[PDB]
Enzyme design. Structure first.
Site, PDB file in Angstrom:
ATOM      1  N   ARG A 119      12.953  -2.143   5.417  1.00 51.37           N
ATOM      2  CA  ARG A 119      14.051  -2.729   4.637  1.00 51.37           C
ATOM      3  C   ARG A 119      13.623  -3.781   3.610  1.00 51.37           C
ATOM      4  O   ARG A 119      14.293  -3.944   2.591  1.00 51.37           O
ATOM      5  CB  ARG A 119      15.104  -3.323   5.569  1.00 51.37           C
ATOM      6  CG  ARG A 119      15.696  -2.307   6.529  1.00 51.37           C
ATOM      7  CD  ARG A 119      17.054  -2.754   7.038  1.00 51.37           C
ATOM      8  NE  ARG A 119      17.429  -2.073   8.276  1.00 51.37           N
ATOM      9  CZ  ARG A 119      18.510  -2.355   9.001  1.00 51.37           C
ATOM     10  NH1 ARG A 119      19.360  -3.308   8.619  1.00 51.37           N
ATOM     11  NH2 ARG A 119      18.746  -1.671  10.117  1.00 51.37           N
TER      12      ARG A 119
HETATM   13  N1  LIG Z   1      23.252   3.667  -0.621  1.00 51.36           N
HETATM   14  C1  LIG Z   1      22.004   3.720  -0.094  1.00 51.36           C
HETATM   15  N2  LIG Z   1      20.948   4.186  -0.813  1.00 51.36           N
HETATM   16  C2  LIG Z   1      19.694   4.248  -0.306  1.00 51.36           C
HETATM   17  N3  LIG Z   1      19.394   3.861   0.951  1.00 51.36           N
HETATM   18  C3  LIG Z   1      20.353   3.380   1.781  1.00 51.36           C
HETATM   19  C4  LIG Z   1      21.743   3.277   1.299  1.00 51.36           C
HETATM   20  N4  LIG Z   1      22.465   2.777   2.316  1.00 51.36           N
HETATM   21  C5  LIG Z   1      21.613   2.573   3.355  1.00 51.36           C
HETATM   22  N5  LIG Z   1      20.354   2.934   3.035  1.00 51.36           N
HETATM   23  C6  LIG Z   1      19.149   2.852   3.904  1.00 51.36           C
HETATM   24  O1  LIG Z   1      19.486   2.476   5.247  1.00 51.36           O
HETATM   25  C7  LIG Z   1      18.872   1.227   5.581  1.00 51.36           C
HETATM   26  C8  LIG Z   1      19.797   0.370   6.433  1.00 51.36           C
HETATM   27  O2  LIG Z   1      21.042   0.153   5.770  1.00 51.36           O
HETATM   28  P1  LIG Z   1      21.982  -1.108   6.118  1.00 51.36           P
HETATM   29  O3  LIG Z   1      22.738  -1.490   4.874  1.00 51.36           O
HETATM   30  O4  LIG Z   1      21.145  -2.152   6.807  1.00 51.36           O
HETATM   31  O5  LIG Z   1      23.027  -0.492   7.182  1.00 51.36           O
HETATM   32  P2  LIG Z   1      23.562  -1.358   8.433  1.00 51.36           P
HETATM   33  O6  LIG Z   1      24.461  -0.458   9.245  1.00 51.36           O
HETATM   34  O7  LIG Z   1      24.124  -2.635   7.872  1.00 51.36           O
HETATM   35  N6  LIG Z   1      22.175  -1.783   9.389  1.00 51.36           N
HETATM   36  P3  LIG Z   1      22.369  -2.693  10.860  1.00 51.36           P
HETATM   37  O8  LIG Z   1      23.005  -3.995  10.442  1.00 51.36           O
HETATM   38  O9  LIG Z   1      20.947  -2.843  11.325  1.00 51.36           O
HETATM   39  O10 LIG Z   1      23.241  -1.825  11.731  1.00 51.36           O
HETATM   40  C9  LIG Z   1      18.487   0.578   4.261  1.00 51.36           C
HETATM   41  O11 LIG Z   1      17.359  -0.295   4.380  1.00 51.36           O
HETATM   42  C10 LIG Z   1      18.203   1.775   3.381  1.00 51.36           C
HETATM   43  O12 LIG Z   1      16.845   2.208   3.516  1.00 51.36           O
HETATM   44 MG   LIG Z   2      23.742  -4.683   8.510  1.00 46.44          MG
END
Ligand SMILES: Nc1ncnc2c1ncn2[C@@H]1O[C@H](COP(=O)(O)OP(=O)(O)NP(=O)(O)O)[C@@H](O)[C@H]1O
Ligand SMILES: [Mg+2]
Ligand SMILES: Nc1ncnc2c1ncn2[C@@H]1O[C@H](COP(=O)(O)OP(=O)(O)NP(=O)(O)O)[C@@H](O)[C@H]1O
Ligand SMILES: Nc1ncnc2c1ncn2[C@@H]1O[C@H](COP(=O)(O)OP(=O)(O)NP(=O)(O)O)[C@@H](O)[C@H]1O
Ligand SMILES: [Cl-]
Ligand SMILES: [Mg+2]
Ligand SMILES: [Mg+2]
Ligand code: NA
Lengths: 53, 488, 466, 467, 128, 128, 161
Positions: free
Chosen positions: E118
């Site tokens: 990330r």
């Molecule tokens: N729109 C997007 N484009 C490209 N990669 C994405 C996108 N959305 C998510 N990802 C990938 O997924 C990873 C994790 O996304 P994140 O925004 O942290 O989701 P999250 O559900 O908030 N994670 P967590 O808080 O650990 O449950 C990122 O580091 C990206 O590699």
């Molecule tokens: Mg998150």
């Protein structure tokens, strides 16, 4: 047509064997996770009712 | 030391006041704390009284006096509640003058026995074709609405209320139906948007809205269906007809679980109390059809239950299915496919049946419920592209186009005669040769045509309540000449 | 006046009072600490003893330790001076910039707006994200929920919505970090200093930050959500202004509730949760709303434990929302980002009267052909796409081209994707999917639609391949 | 002797006695009540105190309120004056036709018949329902159980059995409405007055109603099953007559036990039930039986929570039954009414020495062709019909017609089907499934067998579907 | 100690699955109300407070760091289980090692499509 | 008695599932700790005590025998359920009966693949 | 059984005693008393046990199924101690046959239940990893010698997870 057909079937049914094989693995693991969940969740109900008297 | 009419709080926490004294207090009696909040004496124990608190427990403290009311919990009742939004204890909450009704009634009354009732027969028209034809509801019947989130559950209830306007503007008293909508556990913006919807269609004037929202305490959410039921039971016992919608009883069951768990009652299945069935059974049994000896009034119930992953074979859904006189099961699969309302035909039932329909609807949708269940069996069976006989391809040809007729939009409920008109074309076989995709277009053109010219024929079905052999011949001439225009 | 600690276990501390018993929800100051340790009264146990929940670590506490009644709940600074500042659960500044000199304060426990105060007007809010705008669009002043499992794009999505809306939105914002990563807070703070929305020199900041992250003990994570509201409740009511309220993550409010409830000694509900899961959520969530006096547009990230939406925490949250963007791991693994489920995401303004009949038909048409494709997944999984009929293969080819056109490159995720960020207007969002349903690009390939802005780029990408 | 109430938590009420402590099962009369309120002594807690469960609602009860002991369990009216009348759990009229004019009462609790009292007769009782008579037929003087989930046709079936069997019956009957719908009690009551089975004027009434519906609290539902069978016990032994004992629904006896089990101070057993499920069911179910002194043919509706037959309540009930009719939501969903599972319903009398080999060999032939088809369904949904052998797709077509010929329009279910009610004799049932097995209607189409009485109607309906 | 002294430390928790099991043992013996796979409510907080302490300090604090490489053991590739999702939801990315890849001869058996970093690109040299 | 005094005996327990429920009732109302499916910790100790008393004696003590044919009712074919798991592991062999085989025409409906006798050939004549 | 399981055990006893000069131990954790009889007499007839002279290559330790949970829980530790003598005091490379290791886990789950401890996932004791670990860590190599161990695995529900 038939020499292509038997080749095309042999190919597709080889993929249908592999796809079904991976689905058994997926389903068998989902079966077990659910098996263990039902035994766990049922046991939490019994303990919750028993330590409340 | 007079701790008979009064008592002191030993402890307060999570809405559960433990009260020392109150020797002469009754079970399920309303009591009043120092601060002015009301409580209910649900647990009478040897050395204390477990009192569930109607409101925020910050106002209650240790060493606070608790005075007896000498009365069981009760709520205001009468015609003055109509057009008003109230809370679980009937207190007005809509920026208007308070509830000025003289009559009053208890919340926790037992349902009428065998003799006060008579079998269900008067129709309760929802104005939704799939319900009225396949799973018909009668006055005094209890029909569950059930399905996953955003499957159209509340929408079935909204149109059912708005459909009563046609009857309520008339003069005949037995033709009228005064609605009730109990909101348990929803948010205030959703219930506000719901009241706005009813006021735009002028439905509020005959509708009482009871609102126990998420921010209200668990006892108020628990009590709200019973309170609204007692507002409906007034119409029932005084020779008038009423509808009530509990939206929803899953959110009520969560509130009852909270009270019961915090009163240290050992929980049963899925953390719910042992008597979670009895919670919903005593509520819905009160919805009934009274005989002429008890005034001939009725209370019709429409409870709502939420499922998870589309599972009607779950503990809480099956409990509420086992109480009600049938149900309307909705599915997300059918919803997004275009089948709106998304009613599963096989899984949904009605237990009054054609007794609750008019004679007109009984003709056109007499064997439609079972035929549509077999259609989904045969259609799902022959998904593969194999050859079939003419009898089974006819069933598929028929079943596809009957499903397209039962599709229907919202905020426009249809009268019983107009439903009978459009169902005629499908069931008598005039649609069979047309393409499935143009069936909704056919229906709109056919419906607007009969509304324009043939008001005598629609009026004659509304007056008589049946399809005569004269009216059958008129429809036969209309649809055949109409079909030849559409097919070209 | 004064109190004495009688028992301590984790975040739950009991305090006896000789004279003068403090009421529930009042903040209590523990005497003799380097930092400020607040205990909030949860219950009255009896015999002049009250059970409390601590807002920081209870390590070092001894039985008989002095505790004072503050005489009110946890009060925080609220006003224009909160903008450009970070603050913890109890309103202390945590940005090394001295006091937050506000004129007023405000208790973090205020009762939610009554039914009388509810607005009913639903005006659409254009995001620039196609799946959202098309299928489940947000409303100005509406409640927005972003459901997602572990690592599928909740924080990426909520940070994209900050980029698109908050700068174009001429009004104040609030970001409440509830139980997520402290380094993401650092990323937000210094992003917002560099971008301009926070100003250290001037007093022209458009965002107020609140933070009680996954390093904090359960009592803090349980109340930090409410601290974020109270700041936004000032800008709504006491200034009559439009507000943005970003919360990542509101699951941690209910998770923390499960942690304290265990120690409070209650009988648990299903899946080991607190018996007050719904009512705790209610009193919190009903404050997050658009009243008659002002507008709060609230975007809440919602963590889904073990990818299970039937879990009590997410399951209860659905009811408190006007639009739901439901993410998916299954969709994320296939490369579709943002990984939104078009068949599990909904909005209450998806109405032909509100959005117009052309919008509604194109949305429901896309959901029909997607749902038709989903029903064939048992047969396609075993045998393949080739074994279906000509009518069935045509719907599959369009649905797969739709699924890829539902994907879009985000400006915040340029490092991950590589593609330049795009923001598609509402006119070309409807028009693009409208053409695909009609069958004007049955001849074009699938991957031409993957990660493109408007429908024009899908033609341009396809021409370079051949 | 006089006692005093000391605790009230829901239906469970604790009572303390200074001198004379009442034993278990004794009915205690609560004073200061407008309506009669019985409390049955369930346990002895100690310290001159007993735990009871209320037969009516507990609202209004105060601590220190007086309670008298009857010196006997709940004693109810028994005899031919009960016939035509509706009773409740404690033996009061709920029909508004004066008192139950009899001077002889029987306690609802009693020891079950001994092993020497048991009979072994088991002649067939032909219902007129094809699926039941063919595959899992009932016996006269035998225990019958109608299993099923919520809304699959248990009541519709039990009412049809009353329609077919009970009307053409010389002896008396008893319908025990345990914990179900008061509406359905009203429907039955006035339907029997119509048919003359109950007569309000003369003493020629065959059926004696007993009702403790889901509007009542758990104490009522936990005991009204016993009340109803104590009426049938008099008609068995003292009269010497063939009694029909209908119960709807006997799950509610066990359910009502689970509602109060927590408040009686018990650790829960599996799936939230009381530890005393099988023993409480046993002392009740063993009384519902045929003996030397008299024959009872007992039909019992059995609810199945969450459609799961492995649930402790229905799982325990199976062993108590001589014939079992298991209903399915899966079958009802397809329109197949009555929605009986042909590969799950069973009977003791299904033997070539009892019902003859021609009956037996056809019943197993129907079960085989259906069971073989059940395995295929899932395989041929993916791989297609054309991969099957000509022998297989013959057995697929025959199975699907046999499924439909097991369906039948009931008279009581005329308001749901839209088809006229039909009763099929046992001779024409066996011949019908014989011919379809042999392939005598392979030329005829599929839907002609759906929702018709005898095999003849399929041939006529097949010609109607031509145009 | 190394983090708060202007130096750089690396820590490897091998493995946090076994630690969670040990904490479940302690929690269940304390008679605390369990949930998913009989774990308590604070099993997330167990790992979250541990891994939060891995950080990169500013130049005012010394410029030091503690880098964390926690280990988790999945059952048959199930990343969606309680404890795997809990630690996935805490950490700044994953290195998924697939059993099928290990069997073939792809070693180390890193699945590329599933594995994410990330904050990776920023902490990677311009050459690579 | 038959076993000890030279003779041979056959015993049928019909069934141990219902015996376990009876013993569970007592253990729950005596407030002994409920384990899996609410059964006590000594439920295996219960059935193993019973079944081990069936035995083939040598010539010195008599030469007689006691042969056990216990019965276990499964639920939805779940042979992995707690009480079936106990009596399977105690016994010398199993005769698995299935519902699908019964209605297929296989009567008695014995699964040949899964049914087993660990004694085997040693309890057969040369003819068989 | 019935695939030369007991024959494979006896040969491992026979071969390790010959080449490495290391005796063995059999721990019947939940031994079927009938099969305790068969294993004893088959070991006699083969030669790995000797009744007349002291050339016996196995110590036998039976915790039979009809004994209480306390017996079957600790009988693995009893046989483990017999092996610990030959390793520590006399520097041998010892064998320890445990049959069955699932019954060691099962007996531990029974004991934990009896004492009133609240169960873990799938009904197993909350001390499942430690109960295993405290036993298994003694089965290891030291500077004196070693204790290698063949362990009969029963997989419940054919579920490896
Ligand atoms: N729109 C997007 N484009 C490209 N990669 C994405 C996108 N959305 C998510 N990802 C990938 O997924 C990873 C994790 O996304 P994140 O925004 O942290 O989701 P999250 O559900 O908030 N994670 P967590 O808080 O650990 O449950 C990122 O580091 C990206 O590699
Ligand atoms: Mg998150
Ligand atoms: N007959 C219909 N035709 C077209 N759209 C409909 C129909 N019924 C419902 N909808 C739409 O479906 C969505 C959900 O309807 P609603 O009645 O709120 O379902 P619900 O199950 O009550 N929602 P919730 O209680 O929040 O889970 C709304 O956006 C409606 O506009
Ligand atoms: N034989 C039948 N023919 C036609 N329709 C039927 C039949 N049986 C059931 N149904 C339909 O399904 C409904 C349910 O039947 P019912 O006998 O009430 O089920 P049940 O199993 O008794 N439900 P419950 O007591 O609540 O568990 C009926 O009211 C009919 O609408
Ligand atoms: Cl015969
Ligand atoms: Mg709704
Ligand atoms: Mg019924
Ligand atoms: Na998109």
């Amino acid at each position: 047509s038939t020499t292509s057909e038997q080749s095309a079937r042999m190919t597709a049914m080889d993929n249908a064997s592999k796809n079904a094989s991976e689905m058994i693995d997926k389903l068998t693991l989902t079966f077990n996770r659910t098996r263990q969940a039902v035994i766990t969740k049922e046991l939490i109900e019994i303990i919750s009712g028993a330590a409340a008297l | 030391v007079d701790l008979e009419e009064t008592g002191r709080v030993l402890s307060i926490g999570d809405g559960i006041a433990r009260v020392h004294g109150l020797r002469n207090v009754q079970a399920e009696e309303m009591v009043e704390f120092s601060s002015g909040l009301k409580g209910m004496s649900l647990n009478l124990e040897p050395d204390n009284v477990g009192v569930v608190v109607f409101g925020n427990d910050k106002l209650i403290k240790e060493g606070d006096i608790v005075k007896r009311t000498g009365a069981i919990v009760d709520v205001p009742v009468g015609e003055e509640l109509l057009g008003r939004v109230v809370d679980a204890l009937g207190n007005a909450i809509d920026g208007k003058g308070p509830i000025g009704s003289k009559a009053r009634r208890r919340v926790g009354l037992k349902a009428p026995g065998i003799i006060p009732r008579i079998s269900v027969r008067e129709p309760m028209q929802t104005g939704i074709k799939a319900v009225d034809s396949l799973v018909p509801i009668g006055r005094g019947q209890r029909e569950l609405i059930i399905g996953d989130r955003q499957t159209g559950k509340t929408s079935i209830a909204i149109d059912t209320i708005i459909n009563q306007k046609r009857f309520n503007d008339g003069t005949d008293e037995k033709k009228k139906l005064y609605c009730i909508y109990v909101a348990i556990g929803q948010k205030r913006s959703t219930v506000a948007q719901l009241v706005k919807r009813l006021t735009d269609a002028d439905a509020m004037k005959y509708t009482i809205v009871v609102s126990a929202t998420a921010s209200d305490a668990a006892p108020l959410q628990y009590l709200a269906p019973y309170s609204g039921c007692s507002m409906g039971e007034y119409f029932r016992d005084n020779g008038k007809h009423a509808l009530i919608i509990y939206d929803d009883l899953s959110k009520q069951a969560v509130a009852y679980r909270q009270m019961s768990l915090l009163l240290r009652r050992p929980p049963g299945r899925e953390a719910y109390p042992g008597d979670v069935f009895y919670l919903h059974s005593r509520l819905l049994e009160r919805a009934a059809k009274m005989n002429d000896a008890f005034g001939g009034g009725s209370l019709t119930a429409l409870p709502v239950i939420e499922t998870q992953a589309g599972d009607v074979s779950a503990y809480i859904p099956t409990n509420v299915i086992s109480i009600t006189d049938g149900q309307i099961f909705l599915e997300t699969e059918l919803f997004y496919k275009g089948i709106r309302p998304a009613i599963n035909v096989g899984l949904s039932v009605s237990r009054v049946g054609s007794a609750a329909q008019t004679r007109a609807m009984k003709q056109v949708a007499g064997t439609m419920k079972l035929e549509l269940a077999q259609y989904r069996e045969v259609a799902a069976f022959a998904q593969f592209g194999s050859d079939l006989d003419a009898a089974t391809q006819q069933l598929l040809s028929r079943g596809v186009r009957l499903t397209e007729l039962l599709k229907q939009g919202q905020y426009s409920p249809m009268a019983i005669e107009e439903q009978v008109a459009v169902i005629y074309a499908g069931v008598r076989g005039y649609l069979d040769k047309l393409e499935p995709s143009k069936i909704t277009k056919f229906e709109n053109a056919f419906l607007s045509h009969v509304i324009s010219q043939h008001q005598a024929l629609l009026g004659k079905i509304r007056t008589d309540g049946k399809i005569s052999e004269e009216s059958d011949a008129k429809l036969k001439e209309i649809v055949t000449n109409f079909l030849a225009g559409f097919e070209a | 006046t004064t109190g004495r600690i009688v028992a301590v276990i984790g975040a739950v501390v009991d305090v006896q009072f000789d004279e003068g018993l403090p009421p529930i929800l009042n903040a209590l100051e523990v005497q003799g600490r380097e930092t400020r340790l607040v205990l909030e009264v949860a219950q009255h146990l009896g015999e002049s003893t009250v059970r409390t929940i601590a807002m920081d670590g209870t390590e070092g506490l001894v039985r008989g330790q002095k505790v004072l009644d503050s005489g009110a709940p946890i009060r925080i600074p609220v006003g224009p001076e909160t903008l450009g500042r970070i603050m913890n659960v109890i309103g202390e500044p945590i940005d090394e910039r001295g006091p937050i000199k506000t004129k007023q304060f405000a208790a973090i426990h205020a009762e939610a707006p009554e039914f009388v105060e509810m607005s009913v007007e639903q005006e659409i809010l254009v995001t620039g994200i196609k799946v959202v705008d098309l299928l489940a669009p947000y409303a100005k002043g509406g409640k927005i929920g972003l459901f997602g499992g572990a690592g599928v794009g909740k924080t990426v999505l909520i940070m994209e919505l900050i980029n698109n809306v908050a700068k174009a939105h001429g009004g104040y914002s609030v970001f409440a970090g509830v139980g997520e990563r402290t380094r993401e807070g650092n990323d937000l703070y210094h992003e917002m200093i560099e971008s301009g929305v926070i100003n250290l020199k001037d007093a022209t900041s458009k965002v107020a930050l609140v933070y009680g992250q996954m390093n904090e003990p359960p009592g803090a994570r349980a109340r930090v959500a409410l601290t974020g509201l109270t700041v936004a409740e000032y800008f709504r009511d006491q200034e009559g202004q439009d507000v943005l309220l970003f919360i990542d993550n509101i699951f941690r409010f209910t998770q923390a509730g499960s942690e304290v409830s265990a120690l409070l000694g209650r009988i648990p509900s299903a899946v080991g949760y607190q018996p007050t899961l719904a009512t705790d959520m209610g009193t919190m969530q009903e404050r997050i709303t658009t009243t008659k006096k002002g507008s709060i547009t609230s975007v809440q990230a919602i963590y889904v434990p073990a990818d299970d939406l039937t879990d009590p925490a997410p399951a209860t949250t659905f009811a408190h929302l006007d639009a739901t963007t439901v993410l998916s791991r299954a969709i994320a693994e296939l490369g579709i980002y943002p990984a939104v489920d078009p068949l599990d995401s909904t909005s209450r303004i998806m109405d032909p009267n509100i959005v117009g009949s052309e919008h509604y038909d194109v949305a429901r048409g896309v959901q029909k052909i997607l749902q038709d494709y989903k029903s064939l997944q048992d047969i396609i999984a075993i045998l393949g796409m080739d074994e279906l009929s000509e009518e069935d293969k045509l719907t599959v080819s369009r649905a797969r081209k739709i699924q890829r056109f539902l994907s879009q490159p985000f400006q915040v995720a340029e490092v991950f994707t590589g593609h330049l960020g795009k923001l598609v207007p509402l006119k070309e969002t409807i028009k693009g999917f409208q053409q695909i349903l009609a069958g004007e690009y049955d001849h074009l390939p699938e991957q031409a639609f993957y990660m493109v802005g408007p429908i024009e780029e899908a033609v341009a990408k396809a021409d370079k391949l051949a």
